[PDB]
Amino acid sequence: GIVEQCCTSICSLYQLENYCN
Amino acid sequence: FVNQHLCGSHLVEALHLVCGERGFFYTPKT
Fold it and tell me: Angle CA(A12)–CA(B8)–CA(B1) in degrees, nearest 5?
């Protein structure tokens, strides 16, 4: 999911916003 | 929110922080 974008590269805190209800 | 790579449950430590008591729906595998 967001691991190919955060685990591989350093994403921003805005990318984890979609991970919220 | 330090410049660090989120691998494994590590990303979960940044997901609950973006939401809070609300929670989040991570999509891990292992």
Answer: 30
Chain A to chain B Cβ contacts (< 8 Å): 52
- The total number of structural domains in chain B stands at 1
What is the experimental method? NMR
Query: Which regions of chain B does DSSP assign to beta strands (E)?
Result: none
Query: What is the Cα–Cα distance from A7 to A3, expressed in whole angstroms?
Result: 5
B3 contact residues in A (CB cutoff 8 A): 10
A15 phi, psi to nearest 5 deg: -70, -25
Domain limits for position B21:
1-30
- Calpha distance B23→A20 (Å, rounded): 6
